[PDB]
Design a protein around this ligand. Sequence first.
Ligand SMILES: *[C@@H]1O[C@H](CO)[C@@H](O[C@@H]2O[C@H](CO)[C@@H](O[C@H]3O[C@H](CO[C@H]4O[C@H](CO)[C@@H](O)[C@H](O)[C@@H]4O)[C@@H](O)[C@H](O[C@H]4O[C@H](CO)[C@@H](O)[C@H](O)[C@@H]4O[C@H]4O[C@H](CO)[C@@H](O)[C@H](O)[C@@H]4O)[C@@H]3O)[C@H](O)[C@H]2NC(C)=O)[C@H](O)[C@H]1NC(C)=O
Ligand SMILES: *[C@@H]1O[C@H](CO)[C@@H](O[C@@H]2O[C@H](CO)[C@@H](O[C@H]3O[C@H](CO[C@H]4O[C@H](CO)[C@@H](O)[C@H](O)[C@@H]4O)[C@@H](O)[C@H](O[C@H]4O[C@H](CO)[C@@H](O)[C@H](O)[C@@H]4O[C@H]4O[C@H](CO)[C@@H](O)[C@H](O)[C@@H]4O)[C@@H]3O)[C@H](O)[C@H]2NC(C)=O)[C@H](O)[C@H]1NC(C)=O
Ligand SMILES: *[C@@H]1O[C@H](CO)[C@@H](O[C@@H]2O[C@H](CO)[C@@H](O[C@H]3O[C@H](CO[C@H]4O[C@H](CO)[C@@H](O)[C@H](O)[C@@H]4O)[C@@H](O)[C@H](O[C@H]4O[C@H](CO)[C@@H](O)[C@H](O)[C@@H]4O[C@H]4O[C@H](CO)[C@@H](O)[C@H](O)[C@@H]4O)[C@@H]3O)[C@H](O)[C@H]2NC(C)=O)[C@H](O)[C@H]1NC(C)=O
Ligand SMILES: *[C@@H]1O[C@H](CO)[C@@H](O[C@@H]2O[C@H](CO)[C@@H](O[C@@H]3O[C@H](CO)[C@@H](O)[C@H](O[C@H]4O[C@H](CO)[C@@H](O)[C@H](O[C@H]5O[C@H](CO)[C@@H](O)[C@H](O)[C@@H]5O)[C@@H]4O)[C@@H]3O)[C@H](O)[C@H]2NC(C)=O)[C@H](O)[C@H]1NC(C)=O
Ligand SMILES: *[C@@H]1O[C@H](CO)[C@@H](O[C@@H]2O[C@H](CO)[C@@H](O[C@@H]3O[C@H](CO[C@H]4O[C@H](CO)[C@@H](O)[C@H](O)[C@@H]4O)[C@@H](O)[C@H](O[C@H]4O[C@H](CO)[C@@H](O)[C@H](O)[C@@H]4O)[C@@H]3O)[C@H](O)[C@H]2NC(C)=O)[C@H](O)[C@H]1NC(C)=O
Ligand SMILES: *[C@@H]1O[C@H](CO)[C@@H](O[C@@H]2O[C@H](CO)[C@@H](O[C@@H]3O[C@H](CO[C@H]4O[C@H](CO)[C@@H](O)[C@H](O)[C@@H]4O)[C@@H](O)[C@H](O[C@H]4O[C@H](CO)[C@@H](O)[C@H](O)[C@@H]4O)[C@@H]3O)[C@H](O)[C@H]2NC(C)=O)[C@H](O)[C@H]1NC(C)=O
Ligand SMILES: *[C@@H]1O[C@H](CO)[C@@H](O[C@@H]2O[C@H](CO)[C@@H](O[C@@H]3O[C@H](CO)[C@@H](O)[C@H](O[C@H]4O[C@H](CO)[C@@H](O)[C@H](O)[C@@H]4O)[C@@H]3O)[C@H](O)[C@H]2NC(C)=O)[C@H](O)[C@H]1NC(C)=O
Ligand SMILES: *[C@@H]1O[C@H](CO)[C@@H](O[C@@H]2O[C@H](CO)[C@@H](O[C@@H]3O[C@H](CO)[C@@H](O)[C@H](O[C@H]4O[C@H](CO)[C@@H](O)[C@H](O)[C@@H]4O)[C@@H]3O)[C@H](O)[C@H]2NC(C)=O)[C@H](O)[C@H]1NC(C)=O
Ligand SMILES: *[C@@H]1O[C@H](CO)[C@@H](O[C@@H]2O[C@H](CO)[C@@H](O)[C@H](O)[C@H]2NC(C)=O)[C@H](O)[C@H]1NC(C)=O
Ligand SMILES: *[C@@H]1O[C@H](CO)[C@@H](O)[C@H](O)[C@H]1NC(C)=O
Ligand SMILES: *[C@@H]1O[C@H](CO)[C@@H](O)[C@H](O)[C@H]1NC(C)=O
Ligand SMILES: *[C@@H]1O[C@H](CO)[C@@H](O)[C@H](O)[C@H]1NC(C)=O
Lengths: 174, 174, 174, 319, 319, 319
Amino acid sequence: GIFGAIAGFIENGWEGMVDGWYGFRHQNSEGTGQAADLKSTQAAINQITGKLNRVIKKTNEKFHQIEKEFSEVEGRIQDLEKYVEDTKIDLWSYNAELLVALENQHTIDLTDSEMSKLFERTRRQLRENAEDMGNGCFKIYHKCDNACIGSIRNGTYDHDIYRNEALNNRFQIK
Amino acid sequence: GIFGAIAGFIENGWEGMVDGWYGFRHQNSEGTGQAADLKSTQAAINQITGKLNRVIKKTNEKFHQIEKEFSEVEGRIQDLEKYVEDTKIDLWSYNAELLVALENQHTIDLTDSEMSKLFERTRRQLRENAEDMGNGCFKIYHKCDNACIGSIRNGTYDHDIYRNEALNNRFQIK
Amino acid sequence: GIFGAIAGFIENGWEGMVDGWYGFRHQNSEGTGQAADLKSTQAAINQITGKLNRVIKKTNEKFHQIEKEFSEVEGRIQDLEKYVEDTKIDLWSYNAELLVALENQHTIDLTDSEMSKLFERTRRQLRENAEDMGNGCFKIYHKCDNACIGSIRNGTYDHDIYRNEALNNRFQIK
Amino acid sequence: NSMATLCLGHHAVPNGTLVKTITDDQIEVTNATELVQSSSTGRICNSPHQILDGKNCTLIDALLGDPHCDDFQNKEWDLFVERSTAYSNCYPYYVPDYATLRSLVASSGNLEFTQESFNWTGVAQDGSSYACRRGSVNSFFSRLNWLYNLNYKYPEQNVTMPNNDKFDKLYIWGVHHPGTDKDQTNLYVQASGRVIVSTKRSQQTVIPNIGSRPWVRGVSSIISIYWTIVKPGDILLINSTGNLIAPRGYFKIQSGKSSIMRSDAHIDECNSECITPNGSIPNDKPFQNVNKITYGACPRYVKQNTLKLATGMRNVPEK
Amino acid sequence: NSMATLCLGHHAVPNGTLVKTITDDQIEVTNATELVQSSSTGRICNSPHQILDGKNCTLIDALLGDPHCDDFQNKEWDLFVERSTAYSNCYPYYVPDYATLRSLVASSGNLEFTQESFNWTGVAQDGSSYACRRGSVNSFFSRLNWLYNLNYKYPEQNVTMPNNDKFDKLYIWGVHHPGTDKDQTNLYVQASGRVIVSTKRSQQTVIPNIGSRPWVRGVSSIISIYWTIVKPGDILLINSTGNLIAPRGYFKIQSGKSSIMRSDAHIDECNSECITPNGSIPNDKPFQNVNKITYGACPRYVKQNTLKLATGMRNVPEK
Amino acid sequence: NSMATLCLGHHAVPNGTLVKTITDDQIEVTNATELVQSSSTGRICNSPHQILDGKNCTLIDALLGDPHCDDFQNKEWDLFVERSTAYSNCYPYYVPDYATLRSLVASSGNLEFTQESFNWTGVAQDGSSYACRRGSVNSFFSRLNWLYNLNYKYPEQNVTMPNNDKFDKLYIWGVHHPGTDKDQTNLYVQASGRVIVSTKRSQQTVIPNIGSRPWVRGVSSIISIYWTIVKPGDILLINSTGNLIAPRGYFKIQSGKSSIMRSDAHIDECNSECITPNGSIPNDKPFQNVNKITYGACPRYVKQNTLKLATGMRNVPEK
Ligand SMILES: *[C@@H]1O[C@H](CO)[C@@H](O[C@@H]2O[C@H](CO)[C@@H](O[C@H]3O[C@H](CO[C@H]4O[C@H](CO)[C@@H](O)[C@H](O)[C@@H]4O)[C@@H](O)[C@H](O[C@H]4O[C@H](CO)[C@@H](O)[C@H](O)[C@@H]4O[C@H]4O[C@H](CO)[C@@H](O)[C@H](O)[C@@H]4O)[C@@H]3O)[C@H](O)[C@H]2NC(C)=O)[C@H](O)[C@H]1NC(C)=O
Ligand SMILES: *[C@@H]1O[C@H](CO)[C@@H](O[C@@H]2O[C@H](CO)[C@@H](O[C@H]3O[C@H](CO[C@H]4O[C@H](CO)[C@@H](O)[C@H](O)[C@@H]4O)[C@@H](O)[C@H](O[C@H]4O[C@H](CO)[C@@H](O)[C@H](O)[C@@H]4O[C@H]4O[C@H](CO)[C@@H](O)[C@H](O)[C@@H]4O)[C@@H]3O)[C@H](O)[C@H]2NC(C)=O)[C@H](O)[C@H]1NC(C)=O
Ligand SMILES: *[C@@H]1O[C@H](CO)[C@@H](O[C@@H]2O[C@H](CO)[C@@H](O[C@H]3O[C@H](CO[C@H]4O[C@H](CO)[C@@H](O)[C@H](O)[C@@H]4O)[C@@H](O)[C@H](O[C@H]4O[C@H](CO)[C@@H](O)[C@H](O)[C@@H]4O[C@H]4O[C@H](CO)[C@@H](O)[C@H](O)[C@@H]4O)[C@@H]3O)[C@H](O)[C@H]2NC(C)=O)[C@H](O)[C@H]1NC(C)=O
Ligand SMILES: *[C@@H]1O[C@H](CO)[C@@H](O[C@@H]2O[C@H](CO)[C@@H](O[C@@H]3O[C@H](CO)[C@@H](O)[C@H](O[C@H]4O[C@H](CO)[C@@H](O)[C@H](O[C@H]5O[C@H](CO)[C@@H](O)[C@H](O)[C@@H]5O)[C@@H]4O)[C@@H]3O)[C@H](O)[C@H]2NC(C)=O)[C@H](O)[C@H]1NC(C)=O
Ligand SMILES: *[C@@H]1O[C@H](CO)[C@@H](O[C@@H]2O[C@H](CO)[C@@H](O[C@@H]3O[C@H](CO[C@H]4O[C@H](CO)[C@@H](O)[C@H](O)[C@@H]4O)[C@@H](O)[C@H](O[C@H]4O[C@H](CO)[C@@H](O)[C@H](O)[C@@H]4O)[C@@H]3O)[C@H](O)[C@H]2NC(C)=O)[C@H](O)[C@H]1NC(C)=O
Ligand SMILES: *[C@@H]1O[C@H](CO)[C@@H](O[C@@H]2O[C@H](CO)[C@@H](O[C@@H]3O[C@H](CO[C@H]4O[C@H](CO)[C@@H](O)[C@H](O)[C@@H]4O)[C@@H](O)[C@H](O[C@H]4O[C@H](CO)[C@@H](O)[C@H](O)[C@@H]4O)[C@@H]3O)[C@H](O)[C@H]2NC(C)=O)[C@H](O)[C@H]1NC(C)=O
Ligand SMILES: *[C@@H]1O[C@H](CO)[C@@H](O[C@@H]2O[C@H](CO)[C@@H](O[C@@H]3O[C@H](CO)[C@@H](O)[C@H](O[C@H]4O[C@H](CO)[C@@H](O)[C@H](O)[C@@H]4O)[C@@H]3O)[C@H](O)[C@H]2NC(C)=O)[C@H](O)[C@H]1NC(C)=O
Ligand SMILES: *[C@@H]1O[C@H](CO)[C@@H](O[C@@H]2O[C@H](CO)[C@@H](O[C@@H]3O[C@H](CO)[C@@H](O)[C@H](O[C@H]4O[C@H](CO)[C@@H](O)[C@H](O)[C@@H]4O)[C@@H]3O)[C@H](O)[C@H]2NC(C)=O)[C@H](O)[C@H]1NC(C)=O
Ligand SMILES: *[C@@H]1O[C@H](CO)[C@@H](O[C@@H]2O[C@H](CO)[C@@H](O)[C@H](O)[C@H]2NC(C)=O)[C@H](O)[C@H]1NC(C)=O
Ligand SMILES: *[C@@H]1O[C@H](CO)[C@@H](O)[C@H](O)[C@H]1NC(C)=O
Ligand SMILES: *[C@@H]1O[C@H](CO)[C@@H](O)[C@H](O)[C@H]1NC(C)=O
Ligand SMILES: *[C@@H]1O[C@H](CO)[C@@H](O)[C@H](O)[C@H]1NC(C)=O
């Protein structure tokens, strides 16, 4: 997409994540795990549900119109009755083709955005205790048990407690 | 929006910034102030004025056309006269409805952009002397008087002279 | 554009680059060089070729239609044959006018996007061994010969073997 | 040095669908939905729209009163369905602006007939014909009154009829074209004549033309069918030397959602807002590919038979 | 503390507006402007377009030359405005394809009448009637010449009139259908006849039908109004046995921005390029909701009564 | 020296191109491609569409068989080209709804004529005229048979001709309108006359009007031209007591992609899918400003003369 996160610096998706659209995978001292993120998932879904309802509009509903098939050759007036209906169908076929094209381009780019937004939210939160590895993963430089991981996934991660521990693990003689 | 800054990590907008659209707000030892950014404000207005002028403007000038109302039952030819005009009205109603949805979706996204661009442009300036608190505010690790703050609102902020002081406040026995 | 990279934090473009759409200029002990990045150049081209091929798409083969120029005064029926063709032309003119403006707006944004992607690719690649000068350039804090530079542009820069040398230059007395 | 990794990722599916975008032509998202209804059941649901199956009767034959169409008298409808197997079994006729007369009656929505007493003096009424047999017994169109000679005489006729109600009134009448100058005198005694049917706002004048016509059900003659709308405060004014196929009354002409459609589709017990000639179709989708002829709340006909709208991110499965 | 905190942000307002987007139905921005014109003064501006208030005269009644329409001779317009209070006050007439004649005269944009002396012989000219009365004095359609018997004779006419100019000529002629057989012979001595009006390109034939018509203003007769256009180098050629309401000349007929509109709106002294039957509306918006009938540089008629184009960012306010 | 700088950038060109966007009216990009095709050679390419050069004959004149148009008999076309230098050099005629008969014959795509033998009796055939000369030798339309009296007798023709084939049949015929009552009786020894042409589905009746018409090639008469289509199982019934311009057979009517266009452009041995009255144009672009009249696979006509689609990024050169 235009944000380069889905099909971009995230090498692939997770078929095994069925409780959301965006989520966390972690590896720490107690083991490994996976957890969907509800905010980003609900953000993307509510946008796609919204545009979907505008598209299935619904309006129209016509009753007595013009005849559109003819069993006799008639000439001028019939040439017009056909040209009008033909003109209209091409114009609506165009609208329908362009609508799906524009919408799908936007459906992809917004789902790309929601991924990038969840990454930036996580980046700001970790502050100076983690480095971006480049694949949507963070290396967290301090002991971060399940409580610490959970405090990131919910938005209550206090970087200050781990800052001194993390800053030392980053700077030395590697 | 798609950049997640307005109605994003910026929790709300300053209802009392009457002199601009985007701007700064500070607190140093001297006092707390506020000032709008002319560059980002003018950028957003000129794009919105631009699309406004394309959307207003002529030209639809029509002078002798078909009769749109009828006091008599006439049948076939009036059926067609009605169908042609009704067909035209639905198509334009669609064009108008879709036009406003696309413009407004983009009017919102481009303003969200200009917020994020001013932020990133600022972080490129402070380089290694400040940290992103994640809410839209920077924490600056050196003494920055009002002339120093004012030097951030223009390209004049020379990070080289504050680097040694800032790094020490960032890294110490914490 | 909306990513603030082209005509943005990159002041201007390089008329000296003709073998790519995006690239690297570098400066080290051995001197200067210039190489185009194929992956990003190709990515922006494949999209523009895609939309160019969708826009130029065989459709619209019509044969016997209505008459559209008249050499007699006939009134009601001719008024309609003209209103029909006139209504149609205005509609396809609007479709044409809007299609160009959307595709052109998107083409600018998406090319601006690919420049930003390449920058964020290079930034993550350098980890903690360089800093953003703001002009679109990175200041690398270690000895990086032409071979080293090559590994950066080519996904093979191993930041670990320079991290100690780099951090020593970034923090010290200066 | 006990570190920890935290990875951000997304949603992926084994069974993606290809959608279409501004830049790519086929691209795999996790999920999409169809926007073009392309299938029908082949049957017309009997509700919500009040269907009136014409069967062997066309709307005009029912209007005029073809004896085998008597079961359509005073019938109302939301959609009249004309069938290809229909026929005519009464006197041979032809209607200039047939399409127009059929159009305005179809949109009226009813065949509600109201009789009126035209003061014909000196003429024998209720003319019959072998070509329009009502079971081996002779008769004519039910809503038309054939005037012929009474005691080897025909007086030049004149009658007024006003519209004193608050609604437009639709009058259907005709003019007889005998096939030989023999039949012309044996019916109206005169050699040829004029029929002048007028209102304050309209004017109609017909001259009969004697001459042979294609043999149909016994007779080589034909009737021409004409219609006249009389608005409130206006007048209908017949004036005729002969050859007049007189009206018996008016039809209430209304405006509403009513229409007509040609289709041989069977009518089934179900419910569907949208009707097409080849069957009822659903209208949950915004576009449809079944037929450009529709009636009711329908999707808009388009040339495409499929347009998938993406409802998910790009699918990037197991690499 | 060696501290300083720099915050970046965006402005906001208390009173934001809701707008439609691709994603959301109602979302609050800081400022939007309306794109649909939905109001009018109720009055028509008489500039920059040259308006012609028809008053009690229809464009057809001015064309033919009604007495009370005398004030429209040789007049021009850009927008002719027919009123609902209009009436006729001359001989009863009817016009086949009235809609077409009105349409073509309206687009022509003038009534500039040129006199022409046709060479009628043996026939009384300037016939008048009790219906078309210019005071107590009986007179007739100003642009029409009623031909009738002279010394109890009417000789079959034949008269030419070539178009020796460079522009199109428009002739408005007619045919008389009298109520009685007696009136036919008092005016034209002979029985019903043929009026044959052809050109090199056109061809028109009318057969007068004597009959009783709706009694109007003293007469139970009627006049069928027809028209003819003569090309440069072409020739108008009349051949009438009788029953001819002959023309006094031609109208010049060229093309341009002229048209006609039914409306009862008063006319003030303002300036608005866009006219609707409801009055003038300002064309500063690209769409409008007043009327589908428009004349001039107008916004395009849509079905919505409001489309708010957002001209600001999201409104995010308080907590 | 412990230092190395890596700059990232994008290219530029010295000469951009201005394009339109949603935001700007003009903005510079490195590249664009035109979308409006607004030029042509001025020459219709004779392939891949079967072109037929009408030269001096309107399609109606070739249909009827004007002598100077005998080349065009039994021709086929995908596009018939009518030239402004066309003249008519036979008997004078006019066609009510000329436009329709021109439209339907042009859409049928051929002039394949099949001769049939009607059993005319007591009547002289192959009537010729001084106005329609085939080499200073009097003759007439090649597809019309002029019937007149034989030995002071014109027995009432009555003849049927059924369509026992798959293809529909198109018959062309006419009614002669003599100038004087003398010409009427000299040709048909009976005043007036009558022509009744019937199918089971259609009925055309014409009464010839005697009267002087504009002098053309020595005659003051004229011929009305009529057409009639007969579907399989149907019948063609002609009943004339005089003044019939009989047919000689039927035209084979088909339904295809044939049409007709007015131009004076020359025809070359090139090849182009799209045809305009200005010569062929390339259909590589999606829109065209050449003409709203097109034939075949063409770009859609728009009003803009240029619409540039950006094919590159913003062009930002030396500051
Ligand atoms: C002007 O020119 C036209 C055209 O030529 C001419 O019109 C012709 O008129 C005659 C009049 O009789 C008519 O004759 C036939 O009509 C019937 C044809 O019916 C079908 O026959 C076949 C299939 O069924 C098929 O080939 C045909 O195409 C058609 O579909 C037919 O009834 C007639 O046959 C009669 O023969 C004797 C006559 O008594 C009887 O033994 C028959 O039963 C039948 O008629 C009698 O039947 C019933 C029995 O109960 C009886 O009650 C009734 O009274 C009737 O007398 C003929 O074959 C032509 O069809 C018709 N042609 C067209 C094209 O219309 C005009 O007559 C001419 N004008 C003048 C003034 O002469
Ligand atoms: C064929 O069939 C038609 C149908 O009937 C028939 O036509 C009919 O003809 C009669 C007589 O001509 C006509 O009768 C009167 O119609 C007028 C309309 O009536 C109402 O409207 C008026 C207001 O708009 C007003 O008068 C009343 O409200 C009225 O109720 C009516 O006006 C006429 O009245 C005049 O008739 C005679 C003529 O002398 C007098 O009795 C009256 O006073 C009146 O005016 C006379 O007096 C004044 C006094 O000074 C005098 O100045 C004036 O000049 C005049 O002489 C009509 O009589 C029917 O309307 C009409 N039917 C229609 C139209 O449907 C044909 O006659 C039939 N064909 C044949 C050959 O017989
Ligand atoms: C009702 O009223 C109409 C109109 O008032 C009337 O129609 C008129 O009828 C007359 C008689 O037929 C006719 O008169 C001559 O018109 C011909 C056209 O003239 C045009 O030619 C010019 C040059 O071509 C051109 O500039 C103009 O457009 C001009 O108007 C004219 O050719 C005829 O005259 C030739 O023919 C006669 C007959 O032989 C000869 O006597 C003449 O000398 C002349 O040329 C002769 O010489 C040439 C050698 O050069 C020779 O080769 C040739 O054979 C010929 O003999 C016509 O006489 C009017 O044109 C016509 N007008 C209209 C409008 O139709 C009706 O007749 C009236 N109805 C009744 C029942 O009476
Ligand atoms: C188109 O424009 C032309 C140009 O003006 C018009 O032409 C004119 O037509 C009229 C009518 O056709 C012509 O007058 C007739 O001339 C003929 C010439 O032969 C003449 O026979 C006829 O008189 C006959 O008609 C009378 C009708 O009342 C009969 O009663 C009478 O017949 C009886 O009388 C004789 C006594 O002599 C007895 O022997 C018998 O008892 C007989 O039965 C009489 O013979 C008319 O006078 C006129 O000449 C002509 N003008 C020109 C310049 O050619 C067309 O009329 C016009 N057509 C339209 C408008 O449709
Ligand atoms: C909804 O309702 C509509 C209306 O019926 C249906 O749409 C029609 O579908 C039929 C197919 O079932 C279409 O008919 C086909 O198209 C062509 C039309 O025939 C042309 O060619 C002949 C001469 O060859 C001309 O005379 C004629 O005027 C036409 O120009 C043909 O190509 C097809 O012929 C095929 O069938 C015959 C046997 O039947 C074979 O022998 C042939 O070789 C050939 O293969 C056929 O006739 C029709 O055009 C459609 N549109 C209409 C009628 O307007 C929908 O199918 C129906 N259902 C749905 C779900 O939409
Ligand atoms: C600019 O000029 C135009 C032209 O007149 C005006 O448009 C008219 O607007 C009025 C009011 O909106 C319309 O009048 C009303 O329409 C009602 C519904 O219309 C349909 O429904 C009935 C079914 O009952 C059909 O029979 C009918 O033919 C219509 O198809 C009618 O019901 C109204 O009747 C009256 O009675 C009811 C009582 O039930 C009252 O409550 C109503 O108020 C009303 O007085 C009435 O007919 C009218 O149809 C419009 N005309 C046209 C041509 O569009 C604009 O209003 C005017 N101004 C502006 C700003 O645009
Ligand atoms: C259509 O074409 C047909 C061709 O068949 C044509 O039909 C013919 O019509 C005429 C008149 O309408 C018929 O003539 C009649 O013939 C019968 C047969 O015996 C006679 O009895 C009639 O005599 C009466 O008519 C006289 C008229 O002056 C009276 O004076 C006399 O006293 C008699 O009452 C009359 O002559 C003719 O028979 C038919 N043809 C055939 C083959 O039967 C018809 O006219 C055409 N219609 C058009 C062109 O409109
Ligand atoms: C509309 O309806 C009216 C009302 O009936 C009708 O008017 C009537 O027409 C008849 C026919 O013209 C008139 O009756 C006439 O009466 C006079 C009395 O003086 C007679 O002279 C007439 O007889 C003629 O008949 C011969 C032919 O057989 C002629 O050659 C001869 O010369 C005689 O004149 C004729 O019978 C009647 O007077 C009028 N009016 C009324 C009130 O009856 C009119 O015909 C209808 N309009 C149509 C049918 O178009
Ligand atoms: C146009 O017609 C109207 C009818 O509505 C005339 O208005 C009336 O005319 C009478 C007679 O002069 C006056 O007494 C009334 O006061 C008028 N107004 C009404 C009845 O409301 C009008 O005079 C006619 N002529 C014009 C407008 O020039
Ligand atoms: C934050 O993490 C804690 C674990 O310490 C958990 O109990 C809580 O539910 C999380 N917050 C939310 C909003 O779920
Ligand atoms: C900011 O930069 C420009 C150029 O010097 C000017 O607006 C202003 O003087 C500067 N402000 C400070 C505080 O230097
Ligand atoms: C990328 O890897 C190293 C960089 O020095 C080099 O050996 C290799 O050739 C590079 N790739 C290409 C295509 O040259």
